[PDB]
Each structure stands twice: as structure tokens, then as C-alpha cells.
A paper describes a structure:
The monoclinic and orthorhombic crystals of the kLANA CTD contained pentameric rings of dimers, whereas the cubic crystals contained tetrameric rings of dimers. In kLANA, the interface is mostly hydrophobic, whereas it has a more hydrophilic character in mLANA. The angles between two neighboring LANA dimers range from 0° for mLANA, 72° for the kLANA pentameric rings to 90° for the kLANA tetrameric ring. Moreover, both pentameric ring structures of kLANA dimers display ring puckering, where the interface between two dimers is oriented out of the ring plane. This provides direct crystallographic evidence that the interface between LANA dimers is generally compatible with a range of relative LANA dimer orientations. Due to the hinge-like character of the inter-dimer interface, in vivo native LANA oligomers might differ in shape from the closed ring structures or the linear chain observed in the respective crystals.
The KSHV latency-associated nuclear antigen (kLANA) and the MHV68 mLANA (orf73) protein are required for latent viral replication and persistence. We solved the X-ray crystal structure of the C-terminal DNA binding domains (CTD) of kLANA and MHV-68 mLANA. Importantly, kLANA and mLANA CTD dimers undergo higher order oligomerization.
Residue numbers in the entry:
A (entry chain A), B (entry chain A), C (entry chain A), D (entry chain A), E (entry chain A), F (entry chain A), ...: 1024 to 1091, 1097 to 1146
Write the structure that this text describes.
Amino acid sequence: IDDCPAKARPQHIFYRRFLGKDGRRDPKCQWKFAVIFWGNDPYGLKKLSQAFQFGGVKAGPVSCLPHPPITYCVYVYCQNKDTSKKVQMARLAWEASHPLAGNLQSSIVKFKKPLPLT
Amino acid sequence: IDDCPAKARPQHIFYRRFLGKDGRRDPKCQWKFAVIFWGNDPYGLKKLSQAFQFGGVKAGPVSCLPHPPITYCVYVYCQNKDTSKKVQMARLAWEASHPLAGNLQSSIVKFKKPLPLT
Amino acid sequence: IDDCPAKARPQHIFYRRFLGKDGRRDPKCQWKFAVIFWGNDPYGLKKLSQAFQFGGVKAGPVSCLPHPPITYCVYVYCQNKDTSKKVQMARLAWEASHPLAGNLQSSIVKFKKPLPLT
Amino acid sequence: IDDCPAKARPQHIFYRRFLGKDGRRDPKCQWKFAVIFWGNDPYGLKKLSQAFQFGGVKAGPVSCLPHPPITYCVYVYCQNKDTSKKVQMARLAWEASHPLAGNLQSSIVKFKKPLPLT
Amino acid sequence: IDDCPAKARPQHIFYRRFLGKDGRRDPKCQWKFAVIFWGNDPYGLKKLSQAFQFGGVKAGPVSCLPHPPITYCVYVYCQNKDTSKKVQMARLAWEASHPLAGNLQSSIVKFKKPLPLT
Amino acid sequence: IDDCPAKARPQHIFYRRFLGKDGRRDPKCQWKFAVIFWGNDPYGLKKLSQAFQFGGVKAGPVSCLPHPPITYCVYVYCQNKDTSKKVQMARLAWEASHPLAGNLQSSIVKFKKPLPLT
Amino acid sequence: IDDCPAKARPQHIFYRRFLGKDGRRDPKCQWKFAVIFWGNDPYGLKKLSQAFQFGGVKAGPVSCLPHPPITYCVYVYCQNKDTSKKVQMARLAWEASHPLAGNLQSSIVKFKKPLPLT
Amino acid sequence: IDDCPAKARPQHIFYRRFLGKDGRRDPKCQWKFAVIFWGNDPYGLKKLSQAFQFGGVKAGPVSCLPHPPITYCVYVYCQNKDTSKKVQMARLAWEASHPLAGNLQSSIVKFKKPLPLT
């Protein structure tokens, strides 16, 4: 937690408690699952990206989405189907608990072939 | 919210924000789903029971469980499979956000035949 | 049977014969299943609750249901899907065989995560 | 009930109450389902055959089974999957309720193509 | 074949060739499957019943069907789903090959619980 | 039948009777299904190919198979899953009924995208 | 590649690179799968047939299709469901990359019983 | 094609031909599907990102992946399951056809909730 930059620490401590065992170091599992968080606010999305780094849950850098109002997004990568939806619920928890946090719309994601994270 | 007794109001306001549309008045849906919250603490379970009364989510009174340390439990009844697990996540959110709240272990529940709530 | 209070003994002896092996002591099985009996009559529901205590089948205390005419209910917890529906049929048997017994409407119940009874 | 011969009347009245709506006249349903009752006793099987004649449930005459102690059997034909298992439970009810009745072992049966009963 | 009565021998020799391995002595398999042959002609149905006796396929005696023109039927019991439909095709083969044989309408049958033949 | 060359007429008349409705002109159905007949004998396979031409069943010309003893094969194209296996049984019928006919080993075939026959 | 005739070598080298491991020598797998390429051009279909010979992928000789404009076709036999569709994509790749090549319409094929290639 | 920057034009023209109808303007479909291309080379990934912009297929900007040798990735978003795998095959086609192009490893991706592209 000391290693994680300060800005996302309030979030980090929250998610660390929220997720539990399914969020920390389950090597046997394969990572087939991620969850994309998209929002117009780059600031909060960066905080979210910093917020999730774990044994079972990792998040990439902030990224733009295809435009047919720029949409920014950050993918949050998980192990199983449980933690995939649980992270989605983890953020909504923070939004409800902490009103000052922005509202982010997200969808669960399933990958067929495994991803290179272990 | 004025009608709901005070003790569960902090919880109520939380869940009211957490759940959203799937937690309020969806008449078309049939109630096949509930979620049981079991814990040794009657006090917190009573607060939980008072906490959930909604259009899509209703909770019965506190009840004991069969003993082969008395276990108390309160069922929380939902509409669909989404709100069933979402309520389970809603409580865990409160526990993580508010540390002073007790730890309650729970399981999602599926009913075959419909239940008389509309 | 001597231990079980008298009032539910006529029922108990009935269910003991009706259920058989699937109703007595199957430890290998996990309890994912229960069956809720709801009715307006507290008296008969109490008798039902006393009636079911077994190795594979356990019943909690009488409990109220959420009101949008008070409805009382008693959950009857089972091991597998077979005994879950079989108990539902076991009560209907008693109602048909013994006319004096009240009419109780019930639904089979499925739980996702296991329940703490062994 | 007057038309049904006397010997199976005690059974008939029982099953008539036990089965209910799913046992009487549901024309929309197709008969894909039957249930075979096999036992060594021809006497009781004949009584069973006389016992089941209904709108949704019909039973053929007593019949022998292939021998690799003669086994006699009587098929009981139903509409849906509900009534198929319900009849199986209906007999077990009679055996438990009435001890003097013999013990009959039976299995539920599924037919792919429909059967000529309407 | 010498043991099998003469009348069904032309049929027997036919089915013996038609069915093959799946029709003779597969003990590992459980008998969940039968096929009912129903027809108005008792004579041909008796010949059919005599025609099928095998390691994997057995047929009971001729039996009547429930009447809402008497219908007679004979069940032919199999091991797996393959032989169940194969026997249905085996008879149709005989009808097409031998025109003098009567036309019999039949359906494949599935049993949930196993049957006492081994 | 007059149009079909003579050599396969004995077969043709057989299959015409064996197959019935599912073998003649069902336009609503899509052809997703064929059945491949492979054998070392080109002569009999040619007769088989001539034997099957129908509204619901069509057969292509005799063709070789990949060699890692030349294997010849002829595909027989059907409408639904019923007629696909039924044709497989139709040939086995001929082999059993008529001993002089050669023994041909075959497998049912399923195609994902539809085939250009209507 | 030296053994394969020259005309299909440009194709062969292409498919050899395109397919990879799933296209070369996987003995453990069973061949349940093929893919049929149909087209009006016999010339290109012959080139295609010569083009595919592999450890995991084999193609038979050019063959006609049933006519209710002669259609020629060549089946390409695979191991698993992956290579079945991959070959279909492999040809489309060649058509897009090399414009001079003809346009061939094809469908993936599934066989129930295994095929004699190993 | 004039609008698309030059560097990815050779790719663009290729994919435009490869994909066809399923790659251009199918509004009725919902976008549940994307495909992630990950590789160590930022240069080629940028070319890939520029290469895919279509009615049915859109690609976001180049993005990094979580590190437990920096991995860069670019997501390519599709409509249905067909185009999702087809794009994966579309790139492999280019790699096989054009050797000078780098080798990129990728996996198909499924999203539960729809994505905001129409």
C-alpha cells in the first residue's frame, strides 16, 4: 500500500477490503476475464487505474475509445467470473458510499483465449 | 425514507443509491429470487431487515437457523438474478465502507415457483 | 422420535416413512437446497416445523413474510434436488391423506452457495 | 367415481385429491410422459391400474416384464413432466399413509414422440 | 435361434443381422431405454415380441393401451439411446423389405431411473 | 422411378418405402445435413448413388478419399437431422435384408452453413 | 513441399504459414471435421485440392454436386473445430491477398462418427 | 479510403476485401464483441489501429498492458461473434501473405453488457 501512489490509496484500501481472497494471489486460476471502465473524466479514471493493482486484479493505463465528447476508458483485468463482476460492484460501492466520486458506466468482459498475466 | 425507522436510515440511503433502477418498482418481473443473510448478531440483522424495503427488494423479519451459538438470519427477497447478487454485494459494500458494521456471511437464493409479492 | 415433541409425531412418523434414505444422514452431500412453506395459519406451520428434523432435512422456526392478513412461513432445508421436491410432495401427501390438516402453499428453493448445516 | 370399480376407490379418492389440476383435463398439453409401476404382486398392481383413470392421467392393464419370480407391471400415462413424477410421489404417499398397502418400486418415463391419447 | 419359436425366426434372423454389436450383450451399459410398438393387430405384435429377445434388447408380452378399436402394444427394452432408435428403424426396415408385414406406429422411450434387467 | 436407371431400382423402391414423408419434398426445411458412405467397392457405391435421388435426399457422384487400398465414397445429402440418420439406417436395412449387397461403413454429417440445393 | 506438385505450391506455402501448429500432425485428435469448397471452376478447385495435404488437414479429389451450370466441389478434412473454420478463413485470405484467384463459396462441416484418417 | 491515412492503406484495402458484408454497416446488431491485439512493437500496432475503422469494426488507440519488456496493445471492436474471430483471422492472413509484417498474438473478447458504439 506504501508503494501505491497516494491519490488512489482511499480507493485502494476500500477495494482491498471489499474484494478479499478472490482479489489476492490465486495462481491456479487463468486470467480469461477483465472489466472495462469507460467515462468522460480522465482524472477519475486515472485514479481508478492506480487504485487497482493486485494479485488477482490488474488494471492497464487510461485509454481512449473509438468515436463515430472524447470517451476515456481503463480496463481492469481479473482471474475468474466472480472477481470480474465483483470489481464492477466494487466501484459502484465507492460511488454510492463516496458521493464526491464521479459516476462511471462499465461492462463485464470475457476473453476466450488466456491473457499473459502471471 | 421518512417512513423507514431511523436506525437503518444510514443503510437505507446507501442501498437506495447503490441499487438504483433494478431495486425500485419493476412490476413486470416475477419474484423468483431472495438472498439470505445469516449472522450471530441479532442487532445488526434487525438493522439490515429494516434497511431493505423497496419496490424490487423486500426483507422479512429476523429468524433463527436450524442447530445440529445461536444463528440468526434474515431473508432479503428480490425480483431477478441481477438484483439478487447485487444486494449481496450491497451489504459487503457497507461492511467495507463502514468498518464499525459487523461481518455477515450470506448466499444467493433461487426459488423455482414464484412468491406472493406484488 | 421420543425426543421429538408429541404434536408433530403423527406427521413425523409419516414423513419418516415417506422420505426414506434420501431423508436420513447423507453427509457427502452439500446442502444447497431448502423448501419454504408459507401459510396464514401459525398453528399448523409450527407443527410442520416440529415435524421436520432429520439427518438430511432440517426446518427452521416459524417466520413472517413481507407485506406490501399476516403470512407466516417456515423454511425446510434439504440436501439435494431430489429431497427438496420430495418434501414438498411429502406435505401434500399428508394434506390429501389427512383432510383435517390445513392447506399450505409452497415452492421449492435453490441456494447457490452452500449452507452451514452438517 | 361411481363409474370406477369399488376396490380402487380408496386409492382413487386419494389420488384425486393429491394430484389436483395437473391431474384433470389439460387438453393443450401433449402426452409425452408415462410412469411404470413394477411389482411382484399382481393383486395390488391391478388395484393401482383401476385407481388411475383421469383427464391427465391414464393407466394401462397389468403386464409382465422380461425375465433374464415373475415381475408384473402397469404403466401410468401422464401429460407433462410435473404429473409424471407427481404420480410416482402419489403412490409412495399411499404406501406411507396406508401401511397395509404393498411396496412398489417405480421409475419415471419419458417418450420422445407423442402418444395417441386425447 | 433354435430356442426362439419359429414364427418370429424370419424376423429374428433379420434383427440379429441389422442390430449387430449394440444389440448383443453389453453389460457395462445400464438399461434406461425402451421402445413401445403399438398397433391394432395382436397377431403381428406377438410375432414382434417373440422376435426381440437379445443381450442388449428385450421385449415384454403384448399389452393393451388406455382407451378414452382396441389398441395393443408391446414394449421393447434397450440399453442406450443408439439401440433405442435403431430398433425403431429395425422394424421399419422389415416393413419396407417385407410388404406382407403389417404397418406399426411406434415411439422411442426414455426412462429416468434404471430398470431391473441384467 | 422410370427415369431412374434400372440397376438401382431395387434399392430405389426400397428406400422410397423406407423413408416416407421425410424423404420427399419438404421445401420449408434447409439442407444442413448429408451422410457420407465410404467403401472399397466402386460398383456398389455407384449403385447407391443412383439409388438416392429424392425431394429431401440427394446423392452426389462417387468420389475418392484421402490416403495417408483405394477408398471410394459417395455423399448423400439430406434436409434435417431425422432424415440424415434415417438414410444411414436405410442402407443397413438393405444390407441385412439383402445379404448379397456389400457392407458399407458410414457416418452422419452436419454442415453449419446451408447448402445450395432447392 | 518438393513432393507437392508445383501449381499449388504458392497456395501450399501460404496455408503452411497461415495454419501453423493446428495444421500439422496432431495425432491425439480425432478427425470429426471437414470443410467443403464448392465452385463452378474445376481448375481452381483442383489447385485447392493439391494445395491442402497436411498432418492435420487433408483434401480429397474434385467432385460434382447434385443438380436439381455444373457445380464442382472438393472436401477438405480437418481434425478439430478450430482448424475446420481456420481453413475456411485460410482460403478467403488467399482470395483477398491474391485477387487473380477465383471466388469460392464454402461451409464448415461436422461429422458425428470419426473418419478413417490417421 | 482516401480519408484513412496512407500507412495503413495496404492493410485497409486488404481487410476491406477480407471481411466483406459482416465488416460494413450492420446497425441492427449490438456491439458485444471486441478483439485485443497485443505485441511488443508499437509501430505495427499503430498501423493496425489505423487499419481498422469500419461500419462493423472499430479500433481504439494503442495502449499498454499491466506488467507483473513493455507490452503494447490495441483493441479492435466488432458487432457479432462472427466478425470477432474473423478479424483475428484477418490479421493472421496479412502476416502469412506479407512476411515483412510483424507477428502479433491476440485473443477474441466477449463483453456482457453492450458498448456505446453506433
